[PDB]
Amino acid sequence: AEIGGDHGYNATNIAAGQTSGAVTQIGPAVMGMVRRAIPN
Amino acid sequence: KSRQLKAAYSIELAQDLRAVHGMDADAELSGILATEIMLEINREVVDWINYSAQVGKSGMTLTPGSKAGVFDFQDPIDIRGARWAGESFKALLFQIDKEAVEIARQTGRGEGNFIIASRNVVNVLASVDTGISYAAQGLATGFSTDTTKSVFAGVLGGKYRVYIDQYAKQDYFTVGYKGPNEMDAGIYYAPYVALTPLRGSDPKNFQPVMGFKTRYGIGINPFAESAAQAPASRIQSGMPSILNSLGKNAYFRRVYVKGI
Amino acid sequence: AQVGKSGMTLTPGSKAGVFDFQDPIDIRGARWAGESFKALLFQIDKEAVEIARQTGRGEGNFIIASRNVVNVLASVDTGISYAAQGLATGFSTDTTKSVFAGVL
Amino acid sequence: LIAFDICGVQPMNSPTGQVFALRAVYGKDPVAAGAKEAFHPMYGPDAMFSGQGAAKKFPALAASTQTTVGDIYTHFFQETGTVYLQASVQVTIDAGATDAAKLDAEIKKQMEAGALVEIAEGMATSIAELQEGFNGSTDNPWNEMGFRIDKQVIEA
């Protein structure tokens, strides 16, 4: 069976677009961003 | 991460179900698998909250003379000198707010505004006037106390949204904060694939093939541990692990309860 | 009927199946009838929920009880308040005109 | 007298009839010792049944068991049912707990202690991707569910 594969939940490999299979990944895109709140 | 389940049923059994009860059993088996999956998802979220939640009645939230994490309604230190239930119950409400305050102390975004608790905890909350008064107790009216009409019991003081965990192992309650943005939750579920059906037959005996597959992923706000000015190497995973979040999530605290 | 005052509806210091109004655990430290009798109401609601749970259908919506239990319910304020005790006027305690006391 | 306010009746269609019951089940054997009811309200569900649960075998959480940090031990309580608990500490589970009630109590104590924590997760995509013998893989069945119907009968 052809395998896309996945990562090891390894942030480096994720960022790098790697795989356990044969797919070449583009890379993670976005989940937005956050910043610390200023107080008050 | 992903999930996979099958029905693996025989055709003769389905045929008998039609003959006896008017049932095809295809939709029925499919419904069961899908139901279980949805159930497993909702539990996973709840369990991660409890996994990652900090200990209530601890640190800044602990009166020095107590047990560091459990509220005993029969124990003078926890009940803050209270007499019987009409006073003892109020003492828990007090501790809850203290913890909600701690939530703001650590998240930087707001005070706890929602509770997940056992049915017994809610029965208590619903039995009293939660406002500021001389004493309180009677038959529960404040919240739904059941487990079959809803999961949402009601709101304490008009401030905290209280829900019931019918599968709590003994009795405990988690308090936490959810801000207006989804990213202000601390904890989040991020689905990608849901309930894709599979169908076929197996030539060995040509019996029916049926099942489902899914893929979602969950995560943790980058600042959720609230105890660091930097992550290692500027690169992390937002996924839970013991090291990443057990007992570290700023958005929630939980305690065990006794004496109810 | 299952034995009540049991399992997740029983506290560690109690007797499993009986509610004793002279027992400080059963009445949750209460003193004075206006505060003590009320403890039973608490116990009833706990068990009513256990019913919903066990059956997966709905909670208790009726009670059948000895005249003596009813007299206790009828004589106290079952609503949420500070304390209250008086004459047994909340529900019927009769036999002649009914079998139904009222709604708790 | 109280005629029926607190009782159903179902008098008859014909005398001495029967009632059927539909129980949702899982574990590949609907009628067996050890079989479990999928939606029984008194027991928790196996939150990882389709997920990481399916992906592996777990050590039982039982008396005398040595807890290994990071692994997951399993159980089933006398009430509240399914248990999957991740090991946070290197402890043992009361070797004297030969009484199932004692075992449940010890587990609860370890949970209170933070020693054991409720956990659920799915499986790695690649595990799932190659189930059912795909690409030469082995020992990779999907977990299964279904239902059974049973009954009881009366006389007057």
Swiss-Prot record, chain A:
PTM description: A proteolytic cleavage by the prohead core protein protease gives rise to the mature major capsid protein during virus maturation.
Cystine connections: none
Oligomer and partners: Homohexamer. Interacts with the portal protein. Interacts with the capsid vertex protein that forms pentamers. Interacts with hoc; one hoc molecule associates with each capsid hexamer. Interacts with soc; this interaction reinforces the capsid structure. A total of 960 subunits of the major capsid protein forms the 160 hexamers.
Similarity-based family: Belongs to the Tevenvirinae major capsid protein family.
Protein purpose: Major capsid protein that self-associates to form hexamers, building most of the capsid in association with pentons made of the capsid vertex protein and one dodecamer of the portal protein. The major capsid protein self-associates to form 160 hexamers, building most of the T=13 laevo capsid. Folding of major capsid protein requires the assistance of two chaperones, the host chaperone groL acting with the phage encoded gp23-specific chaperone, gp31. The capsid also contains two nonessential outer capsid proteins, Hoc and Soc, which decorate the capsid surface.
Protein's recorded name: Major capsid protein
UniProt organism field: Enterobacteria phage T4 (Bacteriophage T4)
Curated annotation (Swiss-Prot), chain B:
Top-level taxon of origin: Viruses
Keywords, sorted A to Z: Capsid protein, Late protein, T=13 icosahedral capsid protein, Virion
Post-translational modification: A proteolytic cleavage by the prohead core protein protease gives rise to the mature major capsid protein during virus maturation.
Record GO cellular component, one term: viral capsid
Quaternary assembly: Homohexamer. Interacts with the portal protein. Interacts with the capsid vertex protein that forms pentamers. Interacts with hoc; one hoc molecule associates with each capsid hexamer. Interacts with soc; this interaction reinforces the capsid structure. A total of 960 subunits of the major capsid protein forms the 160 hexamers.
Physiological role: Major capsid protein that self-associates to form hexamers, building most of the capsid in association with pentons made of the capsid vertex protein and one dodecamer of the portal protein. The major capsid protein self-associates to form 160 hexamers, building most of the T=13 laevo capsid. Folding of major capsid protein requires the assistance of two chaperones, the host chaperone groL acting with the phage encoded gp23-specific chaperone, gp31. The capsid also contains two nonessential outer capsid proteins, Hoc and Soc, which decorate the capsid surface.
Family, as annotated: Belongs to the Tevenvirinae major capsid protein family.
Protein name in the entry: Major capsid protein
Native organism: Enterobacteria phage T4
Curated annotation (Swiss-Prot), chain D:
Family, as annotated: Belongs to the Tevenvirinae major capsid protein family.
Lineage of source species: Viruses, Duplodnaviria, Heunggongvirae, Uroviricota, Caudoviricetes
Subunit: Homohexamer. Interacts with the portal protein. Interacts with the capsid vertex protein that forms pentamers. Interacts with hoc; one hoc molecule associates with each capsid hexamer. Interacts with soc; this interaction reinforces the capsid structure. A total of 960 subunits of the major capsid protein forms the 160 hexamers.
Organism: Enterobacteria phage T4
Main function: Major capsid protein that self-associates to form hexamers, building most of the capsid in association with pentons made of the capsid vertex protein and one dodecamer of the portal protein. The major capsid protein self-associates to form 160 hexamers, building most of the T=13 laevo capsid. Folding of major capsid protein requires the assistance of two chaperones, the host chaperone groL acting with the phage encoded gp23-specific chaperone, gp31. The capsid also contains two nonessential outer capsid proteins, Hoc and Soc, which decorate the capsid surface.
Name of the gene encoding the protein in the UniProt record: gp23
UniProt PTM: A proteolytic cleavage by the prohead core protein protease gives rise to the mature major capsid protein during virus maturation.
Protein name: Major capsid protein
